[PDB]
Amino acid sequence: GNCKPPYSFSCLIFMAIEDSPTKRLPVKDIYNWILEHFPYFANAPTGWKNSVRHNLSLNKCFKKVDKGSLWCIDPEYRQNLIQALKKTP
DNA sequence: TCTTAAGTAAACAATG
DNA sequence: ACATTGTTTACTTAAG
Ligand SMILES: [Mg+2]
Ligand SMILES: [Mg+2]
Numbered sequence: 001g002n003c004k005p006p007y008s009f010s011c012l013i014f015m016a017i018e019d020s021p022t023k024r025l026p027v028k029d030i031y032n033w034i035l036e037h038f039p040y041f042a043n044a045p046t047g048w049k050n051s052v053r054h055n056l057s058l059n060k061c062f063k064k065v066d067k068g069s070l071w072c073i074d075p076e077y078r079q080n081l082i083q084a085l086k087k088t089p
Numbered sequence: 090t091c092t093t094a095a096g097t098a099a100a101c102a103a104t105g
Numbered sequence: 106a107c108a109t110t111g112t113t114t115a116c117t118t119a120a121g
Contacts, residue, residue, distance in 0.1 A: 008095065027110065047097065054097085057112055068104085068110055084094095 001039030006088045009048075009055040012038070013062065014081040017073055024070040027053060 005012065016033035017025045025033070031049060035041055041048050056062050061077040064070070073081065 010095085045097095050098080051096065053109095053111060054113095055095090064111090 001042055004040060004044075005038050008084070009051050010059055010061060010081065011085055013052065013055060013059075013071075014073060014085065017062075017071065024065060024072045026068045026070055027056070028068065030056075030071070 007015070012034050013030055015037075016030045017023055019033065020029075030052060034048075034052070056071055061074050061081050062071050063074050065072055
């Protein structure tokens with residue numbers, strides 16, 4: 001990991017959850033998927049975690065689920081994330 | 090232009 | 106006593 005990913009935090013989260021076996025992921029698990037699949041953030045300046053939690057709460061695309069709690073993709077905005085994913089892969 | 094997405098920092102409350 | 110998690114405001118840059 002030497003360069004910043006071309007994907008935005010919204011897409012990284014979407015790729016992490018979508019790769020999950022159940023489309024549901026706690027925050028810390030989302031951290032890992034971003035690290036394992038993107039090692040740039042290993043040496044990246046602290047704050048991307050913050051930017052992640054910031055992105056999960058106000059982005060209409062993600063909705064919490066409580067029966068840390070799990071995050072999932074919103075079915076009505078899922079089409080929105082895929083489009084941004086195809087743009088710059 | 091008017092608008093919105095996006096990144097980052099910072100400040101908390103709620104959580105266990 | 107504490108780190109994690111979650112919400113909120115604020116200033117900035119790029120894109121359309
Ligand atoms: Mg959300
Ligand atoms: Mg930017």
